[PDB]
Amino acid sequence: TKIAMYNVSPIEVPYIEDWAKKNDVEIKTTDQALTSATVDLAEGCSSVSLKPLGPVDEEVVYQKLSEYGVKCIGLRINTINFDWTKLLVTNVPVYSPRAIAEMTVTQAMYLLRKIGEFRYRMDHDHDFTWPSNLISNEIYNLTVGLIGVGHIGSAVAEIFSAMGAKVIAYDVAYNPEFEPFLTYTDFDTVLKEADIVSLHTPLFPSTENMIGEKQLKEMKKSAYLINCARGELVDTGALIKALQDGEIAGAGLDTLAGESSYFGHTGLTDSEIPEDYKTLAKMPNVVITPHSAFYTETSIRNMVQICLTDQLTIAKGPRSI
Amino acid sequence: TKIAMYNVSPIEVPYIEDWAKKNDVEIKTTDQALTSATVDLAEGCSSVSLKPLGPVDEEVVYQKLSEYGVKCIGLRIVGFNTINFDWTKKYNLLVTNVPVYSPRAIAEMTVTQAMYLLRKIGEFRYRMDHDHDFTWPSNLISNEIYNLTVGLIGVGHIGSAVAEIFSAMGAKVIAYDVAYNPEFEPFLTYTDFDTVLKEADIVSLHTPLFPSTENMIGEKQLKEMKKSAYLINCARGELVDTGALIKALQDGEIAGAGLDTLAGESSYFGHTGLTDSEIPEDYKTLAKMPNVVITPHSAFYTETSIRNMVQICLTDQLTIAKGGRPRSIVN
Amino acid sequence: TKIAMYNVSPIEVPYIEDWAKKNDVEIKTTDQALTSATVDLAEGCSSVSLKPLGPVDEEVVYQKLSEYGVKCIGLRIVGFNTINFDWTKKLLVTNVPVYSPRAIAEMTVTQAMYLLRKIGEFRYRMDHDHDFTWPSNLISNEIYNLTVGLIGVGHIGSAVAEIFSAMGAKVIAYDVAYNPEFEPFLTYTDFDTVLKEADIVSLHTPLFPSTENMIGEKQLKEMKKSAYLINCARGELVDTGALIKALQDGEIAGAGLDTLAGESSYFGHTGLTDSEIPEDYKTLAKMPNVVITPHSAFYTETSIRNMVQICLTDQLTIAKGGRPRSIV
Amino acid sequence: TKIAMYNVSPIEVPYIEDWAKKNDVEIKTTDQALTSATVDLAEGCSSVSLKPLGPVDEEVVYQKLSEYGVKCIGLRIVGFNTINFDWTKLLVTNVPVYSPRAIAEMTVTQAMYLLRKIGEFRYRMDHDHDFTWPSNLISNEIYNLTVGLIGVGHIGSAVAEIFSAMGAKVIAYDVAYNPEFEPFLTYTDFDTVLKEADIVSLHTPLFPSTENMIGEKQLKEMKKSAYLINCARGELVDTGALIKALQDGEIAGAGLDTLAGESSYFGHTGLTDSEIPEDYKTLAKMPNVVITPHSAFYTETSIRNMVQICLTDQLTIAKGGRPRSIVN
Ligand SMILES: NC(=O)c1ccc[n+]([C@@H]2O[C@H](COP(=O)([O-])OP(=O)(O)OC[C@H]3O[C@@H](n4cnc5c(N)ncnc54)[C@H](O)[C@@H]3O)[C@@H](O)[C@H]2O)c1
Ligand SMILES: NC(=O)c1ccc[n+]([C@@H]2O[C@H](COP(=O)([O-])OP(=O)(O)OC[C@H]3O[C@@H](n4cnc5c(N)ncnc54)[C@H](O)[C@@H]3O)[C@@H](O)[C@H]2O)c1
Ligand SMILES: NC(=O)c1ccc[n+]([C@@H]2O[C@H](COP(=O)([O-])OP(=O)(O)OC[C@H]3O[C@@H](n4cnc5c(N)ncnc54)[C@H](O)[C@@H]3O)[C@@H](O)[C@H]2O)c1
Numbered sequence A: 001t002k003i004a005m006y007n008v009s010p011i012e013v014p015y016i017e018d019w020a021k022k023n024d025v026e027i028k029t030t031d032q033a034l035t036s037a038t039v040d041l042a043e044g045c046s047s048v049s050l051k052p053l054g055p056v057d058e059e060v061v062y063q064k065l066s067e068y069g070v071k072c073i074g075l076r077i078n079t080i081n082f083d084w085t086k087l088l089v090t091n092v093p094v095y096s097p098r099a100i101a102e103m104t105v106t107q108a109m110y111l112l113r114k115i116g117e118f119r120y121r122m123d124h125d126h127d128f129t130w131p132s133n134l135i136s137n138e139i140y141n142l143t144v145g146l147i148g149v150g151h152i153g154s155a156v157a158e159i160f161s162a163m164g165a166k167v168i169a170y171d172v173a174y175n176p177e178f179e180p181f182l183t184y185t186d187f188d189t190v191l192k193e194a195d196i197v198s199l200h201t202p203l204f205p206s207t208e209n210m211i212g213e214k215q216l217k218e219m220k221k222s223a224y225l226i227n228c229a230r231g232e233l234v235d236t237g238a239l240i241k242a243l244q245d246g247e248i249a250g251a252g253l254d255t256l257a258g259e260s261s262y263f264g265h266t267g268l269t270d271s272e273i274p275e276d277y278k279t280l281a282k283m284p285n286v287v288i289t290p291h292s293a294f295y296t297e298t299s300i301r302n303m304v305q306i307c308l309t310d311q312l313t314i315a316k317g318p319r320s321i
Numbered sequence B: 001t002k003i004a005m006y007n008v009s010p011i012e013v014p015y016i017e018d019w020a021k022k023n024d025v026e027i028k029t030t031d032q033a034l035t036s037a038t039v040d041l042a043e044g045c046s047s048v049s050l051k052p053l054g055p056v057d058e059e060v061v062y063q064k065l066s067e068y069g070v071k072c073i074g075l076r077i078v079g080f081n082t083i084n085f086d087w088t089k090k091y092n093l094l095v096t097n098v099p100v101y102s103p104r105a106i107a108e109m110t111v112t113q114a115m116y117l118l119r120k121i122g123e124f125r126y127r128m129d130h131d132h133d134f135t136w137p138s139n140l141i142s143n144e145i146y147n148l149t150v151g152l153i154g155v156g157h158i159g160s161a162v163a164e165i166f167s168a169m170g171a172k173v174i175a176y177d178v179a180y181n182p183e184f185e186p187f188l189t190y191t192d193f194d195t196v197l198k199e200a201d202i203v204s205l206h207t208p209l210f211p212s213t214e215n216m217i218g219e220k221q222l223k224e225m226k227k228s229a230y231l232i233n234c235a236r237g238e239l240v241d242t243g244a245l246i247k248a249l250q251d252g253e254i255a256g257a258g259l260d261t262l263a264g265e266s267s268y269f270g271h272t273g274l275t276d277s278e279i280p281e282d283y284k285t286l287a288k289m290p291n292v293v294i295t296p297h298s299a300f301y302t303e304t305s306i307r308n309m310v311q312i313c314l315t316d317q318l319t320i321a322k323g324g325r326p327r328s329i330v331n
Numbered sequence C: 001t002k003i004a005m006y007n008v009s010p011i012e013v014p015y016i017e018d019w020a021k022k023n024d025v026e027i028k029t030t031d032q033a034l035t036s037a038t039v040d041l042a043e044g045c046s047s048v049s050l051k052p053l054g055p056v057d058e059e060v061v062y063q064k065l066s067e068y069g070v071k072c073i074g075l076r077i078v079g080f081n082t083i084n085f086d087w088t089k090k091l092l093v094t095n096v097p098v099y100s101p102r103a104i105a106e107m108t109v110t111q112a113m114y115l116l117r118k119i120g121e122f123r124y125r126m127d128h129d130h131d132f133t134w135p136s137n138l139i140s141n142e143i144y145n146l147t148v149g150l151i152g153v154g155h156i157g158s159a160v161a162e163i164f165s166a167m168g169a170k171v172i173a174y175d176v177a178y179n180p181e182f183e184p185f186l187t188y189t190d191f192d193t194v195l196k197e198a199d200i201v202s203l204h205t206p207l208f209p210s211t212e213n214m215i216g217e218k219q220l221k222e223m224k225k226s227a228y229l230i231n232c233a234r235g236e237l238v239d240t241g242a243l244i245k246a247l248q249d250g251e252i253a254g255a256g257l258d259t260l261a262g263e264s265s266y267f268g269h270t271g272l273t274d275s276e277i278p279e280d281y282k283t284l285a286k287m288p289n290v291v292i293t294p295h296s297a298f299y300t301e302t303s304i305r306n307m308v309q310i311c312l313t314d315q316l317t318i319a320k321g322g323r324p325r326s327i328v
Numbered sequence D: 001t002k003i004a005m006y007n008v009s010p011i012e013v014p015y016i017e018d019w020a021k022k023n024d025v026e027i028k029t030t031d032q033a034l035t036s037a038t039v040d041l042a043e044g045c046s047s048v049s050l051k052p053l054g055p056v057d058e059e060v061v062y063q064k065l066s067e068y069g070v071k072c073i074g075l076r077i078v079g080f081n082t083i084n085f086d087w088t089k090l091l092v093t094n095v096p097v098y099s100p101r102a103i104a105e106m107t108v109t110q111a112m113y114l115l116r117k118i119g120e121f122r123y124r125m126d127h128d129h130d131f132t133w134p135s136n137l138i139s140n141e142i143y144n145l146t147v148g149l150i151g152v153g154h155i156g157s158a159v160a161e162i163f164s165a166m167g168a169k170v171i172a173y174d175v176a177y178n179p180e181f182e183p184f185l186t187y188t189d190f191d192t193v194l195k196e197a198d199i200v201s202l203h204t205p206l207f208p209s210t211e212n213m214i215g216e217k218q219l220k221e222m223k224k225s226a227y228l229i230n231c232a233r234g235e236l237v238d239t240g241a242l243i244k245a246l247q248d249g250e251i252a253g254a255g256l257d258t259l260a261g262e263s264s265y266f267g268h269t270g271l272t273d274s275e276i277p278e279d280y281k282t283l284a285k286m287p288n289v290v291i292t293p294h295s296a297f298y299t300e301t302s303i304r305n306m307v308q309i310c311l312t313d314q315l316t317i318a319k320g321g322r323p324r325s326i327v328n
């Protein structure tokens, strides 16, 4: 049984070949996306594997899939037209909650210890002293509020709770297994009481610009906001005003609304990076990362491997469908 | 019962009044040093309390203290170098300090530095701001902390607290200490020094500074570390030989370093209005490195610390007024 | 809106009455099972709610249900097997899959620590031999020096793993299925290695034909002499005959059980004659290195609350054309 | 450098020998006390090592030791009351901390067993033949409970860390303040701990001021539903009061490792009825009490450390050290 992959990064190659030989299956691969100009690669193979940057819209692709004997399209991550599929589809729902959880905790502690602000003072003011307004506090004295708790949210809960912090959380769905780490409560109580506020809900119309002006004035003036989820959750202009006028103390971001313009590209002009990024990027009480929270070996390993072991059980008779 | 307080900063004042009311004690305060000029204030006090910026130089100070009947000189800091002990015995004066005020303050900075480095955050920021590059390269892929071993040199109050946290997050923690403390076995495994260096993904220093510990981390020691590994020093600068560290980072012997403290720091840390001349190239070379993080010896700098440096000090003196003899006495 | 409830116990009531005044909903209840007789209280109801001990085996019950405009039969437990699903082509069915994993996790851990500390064994020499000395073979160890092994890791296994890991123990595990979210607390490995390496073996798989008698003679011999077997899952996973033989010979050191094959005879019953109680229970219950509880690992306020409230909330969702995920 | 050891028990032998081999030292041993017959063994030796059951009160042994030229008497316990300090004027060392988690873990084990009502369930099963689940034996997850500690040193702090990891709220009263401990608990006053805790655990040393610290008035302050744990020293509790409080429903149960008056029967076999007290027997019959015979300490780690910390102390002595375990 043969498999054909698409969208592969050099970092993904070792784990493919490490699996190919382990599960004794022949594998053909390529960095380019699946289109009508690259379906021919799927001759023989039981399954195609993709990690899409965009819609696979054109639909002779699907025709050609099932004519070649492809049993399944398995994604490594809504970019699939579900009507043409009626082949089985799969996805990778969970690869590493702890990767994103760990970035969340990291960015929150950095800000809390006010490291960005000390380095500004040191490097721009040549000022190595300890001002009253830069005093810190221990995590166990603080309380962390989570907006949404799923796979990622709860891991964030388990970590902070392990460090002695009180965690409180608003979700539309009650999970009892999470009760050892957090107290469920309403949205508003989360914003009011919380010393760190961290976003872990999905992206939907009802969830777009969830955090804007109202919400930021509702937070504690000493609080930090953390978004390691999706940029469209935060109204950026509002964030930026809130930060200037000091309605919060800081922000840690792994993502921004309208980020696809420049996140993932290289060699950009000043003119091709937006001014809102340049503004946040300059604030000592902000930290930004290029949507990298997911980026550990475990994530790369499981994105590739979970999907291929899926594909082998479909070349015979799993929950990923 | 009365106590005189010297060197009080605004930030202390609320912990001071807070403490003077919980206990039945009258406190005189001054933001000034104790010298022959200000020793008066000590009148009818059982203890004075300091946070010196410099030596208590004057014999007169000590003679006039015991003549007032002041039992003890309490420091609000670990360091007692500023007190003349010849004269404290000559004048029958007790001295106490505050060695442990908030171990987690420091332990939490330690973890914080480790994680930032581990997640290559400063290295991404670099590519972002200066190479106008927002992609994910291969050599900047991260790992989760439960997959790593953390190696502590010295496991005392701060080390054990580092151990409990990283252990709570699932790392394997191994450590070298000259002293065996069973208390700490749930959180770490003792090993020998060579092993810690060789096997650890993170090496964090937590030993005191002695002649026998000066330059503990030098060239030979950075060679023994992993290419991927990170050196954390939130203890004392002199433990690390900087020249050597700079070279090791440049040669890619280790991957990065988190520093709360440098050798030779005292001539710039906690100073302002510095000009380029007075900040060394040592610091500057390190400070441009994206895989280095530096704080100005602020690991201790939390509200608990400041509060506890007032209160652990003041209650010690309350027990001396009562006839107490606490273990914070410096002998 | 209206809902009728069967099999209700006094411990359930406050929670039901709490939910009722909160969601503005009428609830009529009865301690007794759903049958031909008692189907009469389900009039006008959007839903029924059951915690059954027997099959709902009578067809008439179902017909009159869909005759009253009853939309769903909601279980307050995991097992939907006390329902005929042929006849439910008339009726939706919901259950409560997870209500409090930690309830079962905390019982597992408690039973393990007890045997590990050898308290039943101490009390035996104290009470029967008048002996309060400390012999060599009753020495104990710290949990953080032991490695704990799980056959099966779902909602309960993972909770068990989270706890032991939190206490500083090493946890290993065998599962047919990989759950990346559990790596911070354990290491996956094969069935054999779990048994060979563990100091405490605890069982968390579900009852299936292929899982029935998972632990027998061969497996107990492979465990360490000093190891402890925990079953807080399902009793048919363990061959009681073999277990007894293993315990008597010193092939394992002790066992904690919340459940036993055949238990339906006496678990749940009172005033029992010594005939009514089987010989294998009486043999295990006499051993100081055994501890047994009568299938109450689940038995906390949280589980009682959630079994009632999750189920009701679901019914309400369905009273408004809901479809929640707990449709079965 | 040669060492005499007294009071050794089979369990200690391996670590004695393993340590003897690790360091180039010779040890001689004997299971009996150091008295004026067995003193002869310590000839040529640099130090002695005891683990006492009663006083070394023969003056000859002291002066026979310094004549043979021994430099220290090392104990393998905390207690030094047994050495007469008049005759040491010779050095003396004890082992104050060998395994705090051994005791903290007993504390936790006893508390969970009580919390889960296992004794109460076993009583109904074996004496009432009743295997059902009653309202009053509903249980709770630990993370929903709050734990009160009187005293927080080596042991009480480990209890705090463990229960904290399990997600309980820990609150504590201590006369001394330990910043190191705030991630695990919240300090408060004594009354408050008694008033608000679902489990009260005692961890203070015994002093004239601390004896009968928990008595009639304190158990009235606690909750109907709270458990008292004493894995510390028995004189800390008024057994008469505790018994009467358990009888009256003032608390819901207790876990004891020690009892006021135990040295009459703990560590003895085989005793008459006259020799085991009424209070002990009353307590032992209560399905909501658990009692172990001062075995909290009794682990591999403890045994090993008791031996190895004392011996290395004796070696630092022979080389000129004088370490901090010296008690004069
Ligand atoms: N930054 C990265 O590199 C990265 C990588 C992967 C995922 N993510 C993001 O992390 C976020 C959480 O992902 P996850 O794996 O935990 O998925 P998830 O579905 O398990 O978590 C979402 C949780 O939020 C809850 N929720 C849904 N709607 C809500 C609302 N309106 N208000 C509050 N809560 C609501 C859900 O009940 C669920 O428990 C997602 O937005 C995901 O895209 C980021
Ligand atoms: N960054 C800050 O603001 C800050 C604040 C407080 C303390 N510190 C520094 O952190 C360090 C440790 O602090 P602490 O409170 O834990 O001290 P400590 O006495 O509580 O612990 C020190 C540990 O080091 C061990 N040790 C001694 N010599 C050793 C050696 N040669 N090799 C290995 N281990 C050795 C000791 O046995 C002890 O366990 C000190 O240097 C202290 O000054 C920094
Ligand atoms: N003591 C009680 O009162 C009580 C209460 C609730 C549940 N239980 C029992 O607890 C057990 C586990 O429940 P859960 O909620 O953890 O279930 P689960 O389905 O959530 O977890 C089961 C795990 O079993 C693993 N598994 C399934 N079959 C396996 C096999 N053949 N070999 C190895 N692993 C396998 C699966 O990967 C799954 O992850 C069940 O037997 C349940 O009936 C007992």
Ligand SMILES: NC(=O)c1ccc[n+]([C@@H]2O[C@H](COP(=O)([O-])OP(=O)(O)OC[C@H]3O[C@@H](n4cnc5c(N)ncnc54)[C@H](O)[C@@H]3O)[C@@H](O)[C@H]2O)c1
Pocket: D103, D150, D151, D152, D153, D154, D155, D156, D173, D174, D175, D176, D203, D204, D205, D206, D210, D231, D232, D233, D257, D294, D295, D296, D297
């Ligand atoms: N169960 C066993 O077999 C066993 C074994 C070892 C120790 N112990 C007992 O456990 C107890 C504690 O041991 P440790 O090692 O933790 O000792 P410790 O010295 O470390 O701690 C005692 C704590 O009690 C606090 N304390 C003192 N007086 C107090 C008071 N009046 N009120 C409140 N707190 C007070 C002290 O500040 C100290 O923090 C001791 O009684 C010891 O006897 C029992």
